[PDB]
Amino acid sequence: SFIRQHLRKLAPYQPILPFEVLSSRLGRKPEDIVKLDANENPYGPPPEVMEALGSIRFPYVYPDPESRRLRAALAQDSGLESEYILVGCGADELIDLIMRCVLDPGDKIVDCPPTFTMYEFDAAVNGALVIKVPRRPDFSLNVEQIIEVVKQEKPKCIFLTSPNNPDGSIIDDDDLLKILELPILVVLDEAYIEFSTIESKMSWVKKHDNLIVLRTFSKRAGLAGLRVGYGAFPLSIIKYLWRAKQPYNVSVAAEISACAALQNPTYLENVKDALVKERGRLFDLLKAVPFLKPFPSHSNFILCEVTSGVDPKKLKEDLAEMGVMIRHYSNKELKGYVRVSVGKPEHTDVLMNCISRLS
Amino acid sequence: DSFIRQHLRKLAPYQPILPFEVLSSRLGRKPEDIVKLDANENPYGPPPEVMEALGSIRFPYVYPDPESRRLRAALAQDSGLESEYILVGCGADELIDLIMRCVLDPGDKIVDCPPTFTMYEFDAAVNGALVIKVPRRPDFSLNVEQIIEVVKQEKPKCIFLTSPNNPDGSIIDDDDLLKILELPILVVLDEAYIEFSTIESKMSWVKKHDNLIVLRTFSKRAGLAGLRVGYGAFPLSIIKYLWRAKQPYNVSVAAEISACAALQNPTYLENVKDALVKERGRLFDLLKAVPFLKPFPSHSNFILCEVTSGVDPKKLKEDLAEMGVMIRHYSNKELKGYVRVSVGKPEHTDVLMNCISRLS
Ligand SMILES: *[C@H](N[C@H](COP(=O)(O)O)Cc1c[nH]cn1)c1c(COP(=O)(O)O)cnc(C)c1O
Ligand SMILES: Cc1ncc(COP(=O)(O)O)c(CN[C@H](COP(=O)(O)O)Cc2c[nH]cn2)c1O
Ligand code: NA
Numbered sequence: 001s002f003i004r005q006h007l008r009k010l011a012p013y014q015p016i017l018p019f020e021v022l023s024s025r026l027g028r029k030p031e032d033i034v035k036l037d038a039n040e041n042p043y044g045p046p047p048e049v050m051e052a053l054g055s056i057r058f059p060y061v062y063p064d065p066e067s068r069r070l071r072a073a074l075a076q077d078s079g080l081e082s083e084y085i086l087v088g089c090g091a092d093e094l095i096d097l098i099m100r101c102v103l104d105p106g107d108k109i110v111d112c113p114p115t116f117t118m119y120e121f122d123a124a125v126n127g128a129l130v131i132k133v134p135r136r137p138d139f140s141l142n143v144e145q146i147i148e149v150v151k152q153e154k155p156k157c158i159f160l161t162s163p164n165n166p167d168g169s170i171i172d173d174d175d176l177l178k179i180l181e182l183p184i185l186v187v188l189d190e191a192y193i194e195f196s197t198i199e200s201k202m203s204w205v206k207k208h209d210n211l212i213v214l215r216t217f218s219k220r221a222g223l224a225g226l227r228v229g230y231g232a233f234p235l236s237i238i239k240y241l242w243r244a245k246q247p248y249n250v251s252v253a254a255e256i257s258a259c260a261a262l263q264n265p266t267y268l269e270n271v272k273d274a275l276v277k278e279r280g281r282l283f284d285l286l287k288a289v290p291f292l293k294p295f296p297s298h299s300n301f302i303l304c305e306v307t308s309g310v311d312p313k314k315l316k317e318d319l320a321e322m323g324v325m326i327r328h329y330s331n332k333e334l335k336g337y338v339r340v341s342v343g344k345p346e347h348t349d350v351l352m353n354c355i356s357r358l359s
Numbered sequence: 360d361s362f363i364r365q366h367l368r369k370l371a372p373y374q375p376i377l378p379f380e381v382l383s384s385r386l387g388r389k390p391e392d393i394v395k396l397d398a399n400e401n402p403y404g405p406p407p408e409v410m411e412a413l414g415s416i417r418f419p420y421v422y423p424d425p426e427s428r429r430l431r432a433a434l435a436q437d438s439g440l441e442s443e444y445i446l447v448g449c450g451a452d453e454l455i456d457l458i459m460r461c462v463l464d465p466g467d468k469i470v471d472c473p474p475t476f477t478m479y480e481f482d483a484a485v486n487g488a489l490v491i492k493v494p495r496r497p498d499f500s501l502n503v504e505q506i507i508e509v510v511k512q513e514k515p516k517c518i519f520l521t522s523p524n525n526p527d528g529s530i531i532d533d534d535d536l537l538k539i540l541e542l543p544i545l546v547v548l549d550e551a552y553i554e555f556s557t558i559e560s561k562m563s564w565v566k567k568h569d570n571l572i573v574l575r576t577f578s579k580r581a582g583l584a585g586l587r588v589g590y591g592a593f594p595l596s597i598i599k600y601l602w603r604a605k606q607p608y609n610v611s612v613a614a615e616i617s618a619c620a621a622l623q624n625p626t627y628l629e630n631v632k633d634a635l636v637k638e639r640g641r642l643f644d645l646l647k648a649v650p651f652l653k654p655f656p657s658h659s660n661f662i663l664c665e666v667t668s669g670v671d672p673k674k675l676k677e678d679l680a681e682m683g684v685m686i687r688h689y690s691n692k693e694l695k696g697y698v699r700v701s702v703g704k705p706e707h708t709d710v711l712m713n714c715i716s717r718l719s
C-alpha cells in the first residue's frame with residue numbers, strides 16, 4: 001500500500017449527519033426533525049447572509065487568498081490589528097494547519113479530555129503523539145499535572161477549549177497564564193465564547209508569542225454550513241502559516257457570508273440572548289430527569305452524565321428514532337455522557353416529550 | 360526560537376492571483392473595466408441554476424454532509440463510475456494535498472514533470488517531501504524513458520501528471536500513461552481541463568489500475584472556482600484510508616449545492632465550453648501574429664506564449680496589468696520565460712490585443 005504507516009490504524013472521526021440525510025434515515029421531513037447534536041444555531045444567520053449569497057457577483061473567480069475584506073471586518077470586531085488574524089475553512093482548518101506547521105511526526109501534544117475530539121483526531125492524522133492529562137471531576141484543568149508532563153516530555157503544543165466542549169466550563173485566567181509560562185504553544189479555542197460573559201483573549205497574542213486564539217462563525221453566527229472561522233496569531237508564527245496555508249480554502253461564499261453576518265450585530269446579539277435564556281430552562285428540565293446529571297455551562301450546550309444503569313448510546317439512538325438528535329461520542333472519555341445543544345424553546349419541548357416516553 | 364517545523368522555515372510560498380474586488384482597489388478601475396485572463400476562470404460563469412440554488416440554501420447554519428453523498432451520486436451518473444470510487448474536495452487542490460498527506464512521509468519522493476502546475480511542487484514542499492524533476496521535452500511531452508529510469512533509481516512514492524497540461528495545454532497519450540502505470544508508483548492524473556479537449560476522461564481506469572487516481576474540478580468549465588468544489592476517482596484500497604484521514608466538513612453546503620445545480624444544465628455546460636474552444640482558436644492566431652510571442656497549441660482554456668526577442672516577460676505582464684489586463688506570469692526557473700493567457704470572451708481577447716499593440 002502507498003498509505004503512510006501511521007494512517008493504517010487511524011481511528012476515524014465520528015461526524016454527524018445533516019437534515020437531508022437524516023430525513024431519509026428517520027422517515028421524517030427535515031422540519032419534523034429536532035437536531036440538537038452539533039451546537040448549531042437553530043435561528044440561522046442574519047437575513048443579510050442569504051441576500052448576499054443569492055447575489056454573488058463572481059462565483060467563477062477564485063477567492064481572495066488573503067481574505068482581506070473579512071480580516072478588516074474582524075479587526076473592527078475584535079480590536080486586534082488584521083496582521084494578527086487568519087481566516088480558515090472553519091476553525092477546523094486552523095486547528096489542522098497549526099498542527100501541520102508545528103508538529104513533526106513523533107512530536108508530542110497535550111490534550112485535556114473530556115474535550116473536543118478533533119484535537120486527538122488531527123494529532124493522529126498528522127502523526128503526532130498525544131499526552132492525555134485528564135480534567136478534574138468538575139472539568140477544570142489539572143495544571144499541576146500539565147506542568148509535570150511538559151517538563152518531562154517536552155511537548156510542542158497544547159489545545160485548550162474555553163468554554164469547553166462538551167461541558168461548557170471556562171478556564172480561569174490564572175491557569176491559562178501559568179500554562180503560558182511553559183515552553184509550549186498554547187492554542188485557546190474560543191469557539192463558544194459568545195454564549196459566555198467572558199471577554200475574548202484575542203488581544204493576549206500581542207503579549208504572548210506562544211498563544212493562539214481560535215474563533216468561528218459556525219455557532220453563534222449560524223454559518224456552520226459555509227465553513228468560515230478565524231484566529232489571532234503572534235506575528236512570528238503567522239508569517240510562516242501564511243506561506244504554508246492552502247491559497248483558496250476560504251470560499252467566496254464563506255467570506256461574503258461572514259462579512260454579511262457582521263453587518264447585523266443586533267440580530268447576532270438577540271439570537272445569542274435567546275439561546276442563553278433557553279440554556280437555563282433546558283438545564284432545569286434535564287436536571288429533573290432521574291437518570292441525567294447535567295453540568296453547568298457557559299456555551300450553547302449542556303452535558304449530561306447518564307446514570308441509574310441507563311445505556312447512554314441506546315438513549316441517544318432511541319431519541320433519534322423518535323425524531324430528536326443529541327450527541328453521543330464512542331470513545332472511552334466521552335461514552336458515558338450525552339450532549340444536548342440548546343435550540344428554540346419548542347425544540348427543548350419536543351426533546352422532553354420524547355424523554356418522557358422512553359422505554 | 361520558533362515552534363515552526365524546520366522544513367517550513369525555508370518554504371517558498373505559492374504565488375496566487377487576486378480577485379476582481381481587490382484588483383479594482385489596486386488598479387483604480389471598476390471590475391467591468393478589468394480583463395482578467397490569469398487564472399483559467401470561465402468568464403461566462405456557471406449555469407443559471409447555480410445562483411438560484413445559492414440564494415435558496417435552506418440550512419446554511421447546519422454542518423454539511425461529511426460524505427457529500429448527493430453530489431457523489433450525481434457524479435456517478437455523470438462519469439459512469441460508481442460513487443464508492445469518488446471523493447469530493449474543497450477544490451481539486453484539497454485532493455492534491457490530501458493525497459500527499461496520506462502517502463508521503465517527510466523525505467519521501469515525488470516525481471514532477473515541469474513545466475507544470477505549481478501546486479504540486481508547493482504541496483510537496485509543505486508536506487516535507489523531496490521533488491524529483493523529470494523535465495518535459497521541447498514540445499511539452501513527457502519523457503517516458505527518463506521517468507522509467509528515475510523511478511528505478513529514486514524509488515519515489517507518486518507522480519502527478521496533468522493532461523491537458525497547465526500551462527501549455529498538451530495531452531498525454533494513452534500509451535505513455537499506460538507505460539507509466541506499469542511502474543511501482545502511484546500515478547495521479549489531473550484532468551482539471553479535460554472538458555476543453557475532445558478526449559474522454561479516464562476516471563473509469565481506476566477500476567483496473569489500483570495505482571491510478573484521476574482528478575477533476577468544477578472550477579474551470581463549470582465556472583465555480585470561487586465555491587471550491589472538485590472531485591476524483593480513487594481505487595477502493597486507497598479511498599478507504601483517505602476517507603478516514605479527510606477533514607469531515609471542508610466541502611461546504613454552498614459547494615455541494617452549486618455543483619449539483621451546475622450538473623442539472625448539461626446544455627449550458629456544453630455551450631460555454633464550445634464558445635471557449637472557439638475563442639481559443641481565434642486567440643491563438645492573434646497571439647501568433649505578435650512578433651515577440653510564440654504561442655503553443657493547446658487543448659485547455661489557456662494559451663502559453665514563449666516571450667522572445669529580448670522582451671522581459673515579467674515586465675510585459677506588469678505593463679499589461681497597468682493597462683487593465685491580467686495575464687499569468689510565474690516567477691520560478693521553469694516558468695519565468697513564458698506568459699499564459701486564459702481564454703475569455705471575444706471582447707476580452709480584443710482588449711488584450713489592443714493593450715499588446717500599445718506595448719509593441
Ligand atoms: C465545532 N464543533 C462541532 C461539534 O463537534 P463535536 O464535538 O460534536 O464532535 C462541529 C464539528 C466541526 N468539526 C468537527 N466537529 C467546534 C470547532 C470547529 O468549528 P468550525 O470548523 O465549524 O469552525 C472548533 N473547536 C470547538 C471546541 C468546537 O466545538
Ligand atoms: C492542473 C490543475 N489542477 C488543479 C487545479 C486546482 O483547481 P481547484 O479545483 O482547486 O480550483 C488547477 C487550478 N489552477 C488555477 C491556476 O493556477 P496557476 O497555474 O498557478 O496559475 C488556479 C489555482 C488553484 N490553486 C492554485 N492555483 C490546475 O491548473
Ligand atoms: Na437528575
Ligand code: NA
Pocket residue numbers: 646647648649650651652653654
Ligand atoms: Na509569433
